[PDB]
Design a protein around this ligand. Structure first.
Ligand code: HEM
Ligand code: HEM
Ligand code: CL
Ligand code: NA
Ligand code: NA
Ligand code: NA
Ligand code: NA
Ligand code: NA
Ligand code: NA
Lengths: 184, 186
C-alpha cells in the first residue's frame, strides 16, 4: 500500500498529546488520530480533518546513501515505539520551480538532511508521504510520520531543532507538529 | 481548480481528430475517433467516451539548471496556430526502474540516454508537456502522459525523435507505450 490517509478527530488509536503550528496557520486541534491505508478508505466517525499522501520513488537519495539508511533504519510498528509524530509540511512555491541540482544542493550538500537524520537511527522510524501530485488538492506538500520510544523523545526534538535551523527549512512555509501516544 | 491536472478523454468529442493509434509496446487502448484535453478531473464520463487518462504536471525530477536554461530559451509555446498535429504518448516504466536510486536514474536518463540533449535538437519544431500519473495512486495504467504539438511539415522530424528515444537505454525500462496521433479540427 502506498496511499495513507490521516484523520484527525474524535476517534483513533493514537492519542494527540501536543499540536503546534511551528510555521504558518494552525490546524484545528483534535484529540485522536487515525491512519488508514489505501485509495478508497472511509472517513472515520467524528473526523475534523483528513490529510492524504502517497509514498513514492526517491527524489534525492543516491545509492550510497540508500545503503547507509538500509543498514541503520528501524522498522515502523516496533512494540516499544509508543510515541509518534505527524508533521505536515508545505514548501514555499519557489522551491518547486528550482531545478533538480538546485534542490539537491539545498537538501543535502548545504542542509545535510540525510547526514543529520542518520545520527538519530535506530531511535527514530520514519515514513515520507508526498501530497503535491495526488489528483486532489492537499494543504501540505508532505506528510512526515515518525515513531520512537518515550526515552528517545528528546533525541527526536533535537533532530527537529537541527533540521529547522537548516537552509532547507527557509523554504518551509507551513509546518504543524502533532505528537501522539499509542493507546494502551 | 488546479492548473496542473488534465484529463485526456478518448471518445466521440473534442477538438482533436484521431488519425492513428500505434501500439508501440504492450497492449493498446480502445480505438477512439476524437480526443478532448480537459482541465481537471472528469466525472461522470461524458457521453461517447471510451476512456479517461489523468495526469498532473509536476516539478523537475532530473533536469539541472544549465539544461533548464537551454530548454527555456529554445522551447516553443503550447497552442501555436500552425502546430495542428499533436501526439499523446502514454508511457509506463517497469518496477525495477522505480526502485532505482536517484543517481542511478539520472545516469540512465541523461548521461547514457541523452534524453534532453536529443530532445533539444527537435526544438523549436516540437512543443511538449509532461504529465505524471504514478503519484495519483497505485492503479493508473501508465506512469506518464506525454503530449506534443508540431506542424505537419515537422511530422517526419518528430518520428525521427521518437526513433532516437526508443533506441536509448532509458527505453529498456519502458513496458507500455501507445502513440496516438491527432490533427486539430479546422
Ligand atoms: C529521522 C531521521 C530522518 C532521516 C534519516 C531522513 C531521511 C530523508 C531522506 C532519505 C529523504 C529523501 C527522500 C528522497 O530521496 O525522495 C528525506 C526527505 C524529506 N524529509 Fe527526512 N529524514 C529524517 C527526518 C526528517 C524529519 C524529522 C522531517 C520533518 C521535520 C523530515 C522531513 C523531510 C521532508 C519534508 C522530505 C522531502 C524532501 C525535501 O526535503 O524537500 N525528515 N528525508
Ligand atoms: C520534444 C523534445 C523533448 C525534450 C526537449 C524533452 C525533454 C525532457 C525533459 C527535460 C525531461 C525531464 C523532466 C524532469 O526533470 O522531470 C523529460 C522527461 C520525460 N520525457 Fe521527454 N523530451 C522530449 C521528447 C520526449 C518524447 C518524444 C517522449 C516520448 C516518446 C518523451 C518522454 C518523456 C518521459 C516519459 C519523461 C519522464 C522521465 C521520467 O521521469 O522517468 N520525451 N523530457
Ligand atoms: Cl520531492
Ligand atoms: Na514531492
Ligand atoms: Na504526490
Ligand atoms: Na511535469
Ligand atoms: Na517533471
Ligand atoms: Na519521474
Ligand atoms: Na523517473
Amino acid at each position: 500500500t502506498r496511499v495513507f490517509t490521516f484523520a484527525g478527530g474524535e476517534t483513533g488509536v493514537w492519542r494527540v498529546v501536543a499540536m503546534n503550528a511551528v510555521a504558518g496557520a494552525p490546524l484545528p486541534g483534535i484529540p485522536r488520530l487515525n491512519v488508514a491505508a489505501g485509495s478508497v478508505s472511509p472517513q472515520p466517525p467524528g473526523t475534523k480533518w483528513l490529510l492524504r499522501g502517497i509514498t513514492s520513488n526517491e527524489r534525492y537519495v543516491v545509492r550510497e546513501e540508500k545503503d547507509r539508511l538500509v543498514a541503520k533504519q528501524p522498522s515502523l510498528g516496533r512494540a516499544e515505539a509508543t510515541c509518534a509524530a505527524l508533521i505536515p509540511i508545505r514548501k514555499n512555491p519557489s522551491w518547486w520551480g528550482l531545478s533538480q541540482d538546485e534542490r539537491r544542493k539545498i537538501f543535502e550538500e548545504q542542509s545535510r538532511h540525510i547526514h543529520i537524520g542518520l545520527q538519530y537511527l535506530p531511535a527514530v522510524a520514519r515514513r515520507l508521504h508526498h501530497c503535491r501530485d495526488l489528483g486532489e488538492n492537499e494543504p501540505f506538500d508532505f506528510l512526515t510520520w515518525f515513531e520512537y520510544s518515550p526515552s528517545d523523545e528528546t533525541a527526536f526534538n533535537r533532530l527537529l531543532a537541527e533540521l529547522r535551523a537548516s537552509v532547507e527549512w527557509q523554504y518551509v512555509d507551513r509546518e504543524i507538529d502533532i505528537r501522539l501516544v499509542h493507546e494502551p
